[PDB]
Each structure stands twice: as structure tokens, then as C-alpha cells.
RNA sequence: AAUUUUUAAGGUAUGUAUUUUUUUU
RNA sequence: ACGAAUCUCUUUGCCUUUUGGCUUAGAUCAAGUGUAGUAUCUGUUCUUUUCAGUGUAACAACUGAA
């Protein structure tokens, strides 16, 4: 249940996604052993997409966050879409 | 199917823009209805499954058999199927381990 | 009337190929991606400007830095080296070593 | 001057959200948060 | 890349004949040969008691469709 | 600032060649008809073999120069930009067009 | 209170060369 | 100084296949394991005070106090 991604299999995605684009995931797993398409896509969206925001937290965010999490009880995709951040970070 | 999914997305965007249709008044009255009923019936809220619970293994057996009956028939298996059947067979080989895995997910995992 | 199905086959030879054959194909393409398509030349080939110019391939298949005299297993390792602090130094040393003569 | 077409769905041969929420959600959750605290007292 | 389709004149300059080779089709057999010329306790108890858009997909007829056949 | 329509450009080149020609004339100074047949209306014009050979040589020479200068822009063009990843020449060339689009 | 009968095609490729009496220096 | 020719250089400008089409993304499919062992990249720490022992081919390294 590991499915853990080494820095080589992270470096091959970003080169595969650059080549094949984001809707050909079946081809990305051809370049990448150990990993299926649903595993490749899920990482590209949750981690490796450079348009993702992994950064420190301003003082307005923790106010914005604790506002949403209170006003929307557990819904962490809907909050994350409001925050423009990946859910498991938010 | 492409049309249907488009109507779903349109509907949900419009519920973001307009907002919920309940109004807080109706929601309050509904909540009152429930609470009064559950008092009238003196209901005991369902607990969280304890560490040692009498039936854990049995509730597994029922669950895992419900999952396995799908692949009892199937002939040529795709990859996802083999993945699942691997998970079920492991669930029989370590019941305790997979119970701990389950309960842990009942706590921590919100995405 | 089995045309109802919709699968078929071409009439040539025997299809799937052998798992070993897939790895050879997959490990060439992965070394094409990470390499960004460059042709890294063999050491004996008697020099198409190289992206860098130091990396080569010995009479065996391995990759080598000709400055640092290091041997590398894969492109991924090389990019570690080219981004390393030793391959930094040997450029500076050759930097000085040229700046003292012409 | 036209751009160059790059498709997400094909790479043949060579050639390598804004708006916020509503006051609807803000108001509804309070009523459920208030009405619950009242009922839990 | 269809680009330039096919010109008729090259097919119209072929030396077959004025007609085709003389194949007799089944739809060129003479038909319509002539022309035509013009000239109270129960009620109380409860808690809650008492434009055409131009588009195919956002239209009103469409939602009715996916309201039924997608069940 | 700016582009130029194919008219003005044509004029400019006309002037350029006028100047070049006038210089050939001056340096040549430093180093130192119409008949139409009665049978057919075909007109004939007397020609100096010189200046015609000079013309052909001018055209060929200018073509050589243009071809060469463009060729040098070929050479520098590929050797200058090594920043982003590229699989082949054509890729790099296209992405330099993307640099022109900015 | 009475039906109704069968032949082709989409599957085993396709392409090239091959039996020749020695065109005048 | 100037009319002015030719080679060299920068810039502006000009620019190359700047992906052959179409449909239900046209459809679907993918990684063996265990025991022993070596090779090879990168990151982090040290060229820095004396003497006494251990240690080494000699270093190094390790061990004490001013
Ligand atoms: Mg077929
Ligand atoms: Mg057909
Ligand atoms: Zn090096």
C-alpha cells in the first residue's frame, strides 16, 4: 500500500507530463514502471503540478481557514477550492 | 453521459453562486424535529468502535464476503480487480492489522 | 456473424512480445526524457555542439565526466553530479588553469 | 500574429477560478451552530 | 488537411464520353417526364404546516431531457 | 515603429540598388536602340555584352551574401539559447519563436 | 379465423523479380 | 571634415511542419519473489593549539590533561 514515489519517479513524471500532456495518463505510466495511471494522475494533481501552492501561511489565511472550516464543516475539497490550495495541506 | 455531467457541473456552480436553498429558518425547525423525536424515543447515540469490540471480526467477515461476491463470477480480470482481490485476501490473512487500518482511517482521513 | 463483437486482428505475426523486450524499450525512453533528447557521444568517436560538453560514454556503456573522472550509472545520477559541488570546483580549477595560460 | 496550437490531448510526432462564497453559507451554519448549542444545553 | 479538394473540370475534361462510359444507373431512368407550369387537531400538529434562452444545453427543454432519461 | 508594408520596402530596396549601381559607375570612371522587323512586329534592342555579365554577377553575388548572412543567423541562433529542455533542433527553434511572441 | 424456408461481402494480405539468343565502333 | 565603395559586428525587421483530419479521450490492456555480496553519484562533518599511550608500511585514526 506504499506506492511511494522516489525522486526519480517524480522527475520522470514532470518530463512525461511535459511530453504527453495531462489527459494522456495511460501513456505516462508506460514510461514509469511500478505505477499505474490512477497513481500517476493522482500525484500530478496532489503534488507535482507547479501551479500548486506549497508555501507558508499568512495571518489572513489562518483567519480565512478557521472561518471556512467553521462555516463549512468537514468539506475539505470545497474549502481548498476556496483557498486555492491542495486539500491535504489545507 | 457527457451531457449529464455537464448539467451536474452547471447545477453545482449555480449552487455556489446563489447559495443553499434551505434558509436558516427551515434548517432550525428540522433540527428541532429530530432532537425532539430522539428524546421521545430515548435513543442512545452509536459509539465509535472500541479497540476490543466483540463483533469486529464478524462485521469484517460480512463486509469482505460482500466484496468478494463480486469477483466470484468474473472471468478475465482487469488490474484494479486484481488489486482489490489482493486487498481482500490480505484482509483475511491479517484481520487484526486491517481492523487497525480501518479504525485509523475512521479517525484521521478527511481527504 | 461474429462481426457483431467489434474486436479483430491484423494478419501478421505473433503479437505481444516478451516482457524483457518491454524493459529495453522503457529504459531507453526514460533515458531519452531525462536526457532531454541529447546525444551523448562515445569516448572513442573523434568529435553538433554538446549541451554541456564534458559528459560521454566509455567503451563500455557507462557515462563518465571527463573533468572529474567520475563514473555514472544513469542520467539521473549525472544531473546530480552536474549539480554537485565537486563538478563545480573542477570547472573553477580548469578556469584558473586556463586563465594562467593561452 | 497567431499563437501556436498546443493540445493537452495530443502531442504527435515532434514539437514538445476566482469568486468567494455567499452569505447563504455563512448564515445557515450559524443557525445550525446556535440551535445545536441551545439544544445541547 | 483536405486543403484543395478536387476540381470538376479535370473530371469534366476526361475522354470517357459526354455521358459517362455508358453505364445506365437506376436513378437516371426516365421519371416525372412532364413539367408543370404555373398559371382539526391533525392539521395543526406538523412543524412546517401552512422566456426563451438561446442555447441547447441551458434551455428548458434540455433539463427535462436529462431529468428523465438519466433517471 | 515598426513593420513596413511591401510597397515602401520595395522602394527602399530600389534606392539601395540605385546607390550601389552609381558606385560601380564612379569606380569604373576612376579606373579609366530599337529595330522592328517589317515581316513580324518583333522588336530588337542592341545590347552591350558588358554590364550584362556585370548584372548577372551582381545578382549571384548578392544572393550569395544574403544566403550566407542568414546562414550565420542559423549558426548563432542554435548555439546561443541552451536554457529550457529540448528534444530536437526543431523544438528549440519553435521555442525561440515563442521568445519572439513575447 | 394459420407462419414460411436464401445467397454474396466485411479473414486469412499486398507488392517486386523471375521461361528471353549475344543490334554493327 | 566631407560625397563614397568593400569586409567584420550589434540591433530593428523577415522567419522556418508553428503537430495531417474525423468518432463513443475512437476502444482496450500493463510492476514476480528470497538468500548472500560488490560497484557507483549526491548531501553532511574535518586540513586547527602541545605532549603520553593504542594504532599504521609511514600516515591517518582513536585515547588523556594545559
Ligand atoms: Mg479487420
Ligand atoms: Mg465497413
Ligand atoms: Zn564532473
Curated annotation (Swiss-Prot), chain A:
It comes from Saccharomyces cerevisiae (strain ATCC 204508 / S288c). The lineage of its organism: Eukaryota, Fungi, Dikarya, Ascomycota, Saccharomycotina. It is found in: Cytoplasm; Nucleus. This is Pre-mRNA-splicing factor CEF1. Present with 784 molecules/cell in log phase SD medium. Belongs to the NTC complex (or PRP19-associated complex), composed of at least CEF1, CLF1, ISY1, NTC20, SNT309, SYF1, SYF2, and PRP19. It comes from the Eukaryota. Residues 25-48, 76-90 bind DNA. Changing residue 44 to G: No effect. Slower growth and thermosensitivity. Complete loss of function. Complete loss of function. The chain holds residues 9 to 98 of 590 of the full protein. Belongs to the CEF1 family. Involved in pre-mRNA splicing and cell cycle control. Required for the binding of the NTC complex (or PRP19-associated complex) components to the spliceosome to mediate conformational rearrangement or to stabilize the structure of the spliceosome after U4 snRNA dissociation, which leads to spliceosome maturation. Its absence leads to an arrest of the cell cycle, possibly due to the inefficient splicing of TUB1. Residues 1-52, 55-90 form the HTH myb-type domain. Changing residue 25 to G: No effect. Slower growth and thermosensitivity. Complete loss of function. Complete loss of function.
From Swiss-Prot, chain B:
It is found in: Nucleus. Coiled coil: none annotated. It comes from the Eukaryota. Functions as a scaffold that mediates the ordered assembly of spliceosomal proteins and snRNAs. Required for association of BRR2 with the spliceosomal U5 snRNP, and the subsequent assembly of the U4/U6-U5 tri-snRNP complex. Functions as a scaffold that positions spliceosomal U2, U5 and U6 snRNAs at splice sites on pre-mRNA substrates, so that splicing can occur. Interacts with both the 5' and the 3' splice site, as well as the branch region. Has a role in branch site-3' splice site selection. Associates with the branch site-3' splice 3'-exon region. Also has a role in cell cycle. Present with 468 molecules/cell in log phase SD medium. Component of the U4/U6-U5 tri-snRNP complex composed of the U4, U6 and U5 snRNAs and at least PRP3, PRP4, PRP6, PRP8, PRP18, PRP31, PRP38, SNU13, SNU23, SNU66, SNU114, SPP381, SMB1, SMD1, SMD2, SMD3, SMX2, SMX3, LSM2, LSM3, LSM4, LSM5, LSM6, LSM7, LSM8, BRR2 and DIB1. This is Pre-mRNA-splicing factor 8. It comes from Saccharomyces cerevisiae (strain ATCC 204508 / S288c). The gene is PRP8.
Curated annotation (Swiss-Prot), chain C:
The chain holds residues 1 to 105 of 266 of the full protein. Transmembrane segments: none annotated. Present with 3460 molecules/cell in log phase SD medium. Belongs to the SF3A2 family. A zinc finger (Matrin-type) spans 63-93. This is Pre-mRNA-splicing factor PRP11. It comes from Saccharomyces cerevisiae (strain ATCC 204508 / S288c). It is found in: Nucleus. mRNA splicing factors, PRP9, PRP11, and PRP21, are necessary for addition of the U2 snRNP to the pre-mRNA in an early step of spliceosome assembly. Belongs to the CWC complex (or CEF1-associated complex), a spliceosome sub-complex reminiscent of a late-stage spliceosome composed of the U2, U5 and U6 snRNAs and at least BUD13, BUD31, BRR2, CDC40, CEF1, CLF1, CUS1, CWC2, CWC15, CWC21, CWC22, CWC23, CWC24, CWC25, CWC27, ECM2, HSH155, IST3, ISY1, LEA1, MSL1, NTC20, PRP8, PRP9, PRP11, PRP19, PRP21, PRP22, PRP45, PRP46, SLU7, SMB1, SMD1, SMD2, SMD3, SMX2, SMX3, SNT309, SNU114, SPP2, SYF1, SYF2, RSE1 and YJU2. Interacts with CUS2.
From Swiss-Prot, chain E:
The keyword Electron transport does not apply. One of its GO terms (biological process) is mRNA cis splicing, via spliceosome. GO terms for molecular function: RNA binding. Pfam families: Cwf_Cwc_15. It is found in: Nucleus. Its main location: nucleus. Residues 1-18 are annotated as: Disordered. InterPro entries: Cwf_Cwc_15. GO terms for cellular component: catalytic step 2 spliceosome; nucleus; Prp19 complex; U2-type spliceosomal complex. It comes from the Eukaryota. Disulfide bonds: none annotated. Belongs to the CWC15 family. Belongs to the CWC complex (or CEF1-associated complex), a spliceosome sub-complex reminiscent of a late-stage spliceosome composed of the U2, U5 and U6 snRNAs and at least BUD13, BRR2, CDC40, CEF1, CLF1, CUS1, CWC2, CWC15, CWC21, CWC22, CWC23, CWC24, CWC25, CWC27, ECM2, HSH155, IST3, ISY1, LEA1, MSL1, NTC20, PRP8, PRP9, PRP11, PRP19, PRP21, PRP22, PRP45, PRP46, SLU7, SMB1, SMD1, SMD2, SMD3, SMX2, SMX3, SNT309, SNU114, SPP2, SYF1, SYF2, RSE1 and YJU2. Involved in pre-mRNA splicing. This is Pre-mRNA-splicing factor CWC15. It comes from Saccharomyces cerevisiae (strain ATCC 204508 / S288c). The lineage of its organism: Eukaryota, Fungi, Dikarya, Ascomycota, Saccharomycotina. The gene is CWC15.
